Amino acid sequence: LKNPPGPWGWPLIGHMLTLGKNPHLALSRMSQQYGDVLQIRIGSTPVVVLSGLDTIRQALVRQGDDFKGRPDLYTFTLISNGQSMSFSPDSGPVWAARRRLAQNGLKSFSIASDPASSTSCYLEEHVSKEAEVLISTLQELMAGPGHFNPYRYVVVSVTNVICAICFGRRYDHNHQELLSLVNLNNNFGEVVGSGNPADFIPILRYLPNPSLNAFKDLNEKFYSFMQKMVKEHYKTFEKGHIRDITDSLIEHCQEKQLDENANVQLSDEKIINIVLDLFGAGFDTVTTAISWSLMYLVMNPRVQRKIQEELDTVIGRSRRPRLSDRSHLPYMEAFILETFRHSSFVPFTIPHSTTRDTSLKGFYIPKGRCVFVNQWQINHDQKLWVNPSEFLPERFLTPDGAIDKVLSEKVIIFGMGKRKCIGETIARWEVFLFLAILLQRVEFSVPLGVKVDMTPIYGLTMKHACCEHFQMQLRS
Ligand code: HEM
Ligand SMILES: C#Cc1cccc(Nc2ncnc3cc(OCCOC)c(OCCOC)cc23)c1
Numbered sequence: 001l002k003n004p005p006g007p008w009g010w011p012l013i014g015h016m017l018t019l020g021k022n023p024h025l026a027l028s029r030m031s032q033q034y035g036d037v038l039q040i041r042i043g044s045t046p047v048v049v050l051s052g053l054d055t056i057r058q059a060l061v062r063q064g065d066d067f068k069g070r071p072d073l074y075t076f077t078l079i080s081n082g083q084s085m086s087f088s089p090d091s092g093p094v095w096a097a098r099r100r101l102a103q104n105g106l107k108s109f110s111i112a113s114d115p116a117s118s119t120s121c122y123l124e125e126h127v128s129k130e131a132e133v134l135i136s137t138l139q140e141l142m143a144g145p146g147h148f149n150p151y152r153y154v155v156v157s158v159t160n161v162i163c164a165i166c167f168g169r170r171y172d173h174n175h176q177e178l179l180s181l182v183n184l185n186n187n188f189g190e191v192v193g194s195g196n197p198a199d200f201i202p203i204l205r206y207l208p209n210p211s212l213n214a215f216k217d218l219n220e221k222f223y224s225f226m227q228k229m230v231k232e233h234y235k236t237f238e239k240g241h242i243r244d245i246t247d248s249l250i251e252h253c254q255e256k257q258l259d260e261n262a263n264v265q266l267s268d269e270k271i272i273n274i275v276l277d278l279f280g281a282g283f284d285t286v287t288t289a290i291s292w293s294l295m296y297l298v299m300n301p302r303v304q305r306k307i308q309e310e311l312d313t314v315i316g317r318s319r320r321p322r323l324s325d326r327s328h329l330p331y332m333e334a335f336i337l338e339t340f341r342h343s344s345f346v347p348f349t350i351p352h353s354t355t356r357d358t359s360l361k362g363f364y365i366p367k368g369r370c371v372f373v374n375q376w377q378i379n380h381d382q383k384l385w386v387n388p389s390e391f392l393p394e395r396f397l398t399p400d401g402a403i404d405k406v407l408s409e410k411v412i413i414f415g416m417g418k419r420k421c422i423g424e425t426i427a428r429w430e431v432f433l434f435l436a437i438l439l440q441r442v443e444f445s446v447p448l449g450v451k452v453d454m455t456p457i458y459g460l461t462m463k464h465a466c467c468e469h470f471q472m473q474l475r476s
Pocket of ligand 1: 087099278279286289349350414415418421424426
């Protein structure tokens with residue numbers, strides 16, 4: 001076996017400067033020279049960057065138990081009181097137990113049928129309500145200012161959906177608490193993105209760092225917001241009426257104190273703070289997905305109509321769209337796939353770490369080695385796509401107008417293996433409904449002669465420059 005190849009790097013800082021502010025681009029160029037498995041250093045810490053579709057499937061799936069770890073990074077110790085299911089270094093049985101708790105909690109209050117309704121699930125009911133409230137809230141703004149920034153109001157609608165799933169409450173568009181955590185200068189993705197020097201340069205943690213201090217401050221608010229919520233739930237907890245994911249986790253803490261010799265490492269805190277990762281991933285990722293979609297629709301009015309054309313054909317305007325129709329709207333799915341692929345707003349997965357001495361593609365990787373997974377490289381690989389820099393939803397469509405299931409499965413944005421996203425289905429359905437309910441009823445546009453920076457801003461979930469020039473109009 002051999003060591004992974006890689007370019008020369010400075011002895012003290014390594015390849016920190018080569019990455020720059022857009023590591024996904026710098027490491028994609030690098031992979032073109034050194035291949036799917038290459039090695040770098042940020043400061044003194046070695047890091048292995050994985051690219052290529054087959055090679056990544058090899059490591060995360062076929063050797064998933066070897067690459068299911070999390071590196072011991074400082075920024076992660078500041079997330080969820082240093083006991084985050086998703087970010088802590090714990091990758092053993094305690095983690096797997098928490099993961100199953102999250103999986104069941106989501107399934108029970110997202111995909112399961114809502115007792116109030118017969119023909120709808122929890123998720124479908126929530127999105128329909130918020131989608132309607134979103135249209136009304138935008139009609140107010142078109143009557144007055146005549147223009148708006150969609151992110152400010154889409155982030156609220158998306159939060160109420162995941163907030164109802166986790167806590168059993170929704171918030172008005174002007175509840176400070178909400179905006180105080182979601183849109184009030186939240187730099188989580190800014191600091192957690194792979195390659196943060198603070199994680200590899202120990203001195204940057206102690207120097208004047210306004211970005212890092214804001215990260216510690218707001219993370220402590222989240223954990224205090226949780227205590228408020230968990231306390232409000234324990235007080236009103238009805239033993240036979242489980243209301244949301246917070247209750248299903250409290251329900252599991254009760255059955256735990258009833259065991260003769262219960263386990264101590266899966267503490268009550270590590271069982272309750274799971275809702276924090278679900279809520280944090282929930283409102284952030286889906287909001288960014290919808291935001292990019294609106295940007296692509298406004299910058300490509302051609303594809304906007306073709307979506308609206310397929311809606312009028314497949315459904316019409318006599319009723320709102322529903323999940324059952326998702327299977328019969330191929331252009332909508334091709335547009336969502338092309339949004340995930342073109343933007344790749346999650347360019348890197350959360351960094352992984354090797355749980356044991358292993359090998360990959362003929363190279364030796366020791367235990368504890370930090371690993372980056374470059375999804376952006378896949379979604380923009382010249383080998384897999386034709387003109388990857390162009391936004392072409394039609395690339396996933398066959399000559400007869402159906403989804404090319406083989407090509408759609410090469411869009412990697414949710415991860416793979418033992419660590420893949422556990423809210424993938426919720427995201428794919430939630431994004432579909434918001435766009436379907438909206439584009440059936442309204443038409444978005446942006447006037448000529450105004451700057452609309454489509455350049456992504458690097459981070460865990462890449463954002464774009466806020467745009468205050470969006471306009472909405474009802475349809476005929
Ligand atoms: C477009 C929407 C979404 C995208 C693109 C996305 C993507 C991802 C990615 C790339 C990862 C890490 C992959 C890896 O480490 O190998 C991840 C992890 C995770 N996601 Fe998502 N996600 C989305 C929506 C959601 C939603 C809606 C939820 C919950 C309601 C969620 C919950 C989680 C959790 C808990 C993890 C951590 C799992 C673990 O570390 O074991 N995600 N997601
Ligand atoms: C991929 C992925 C993934 C996967 C799992 C989880 C998470 N997210 C979180 N997970 C846990 N805690 C989060 C806390 C968060 O807010 C704390 C604010 O501190 C500035 C938070 O903010 C998201 C807002 O985007 C700007 C996200 C949290 C993401």
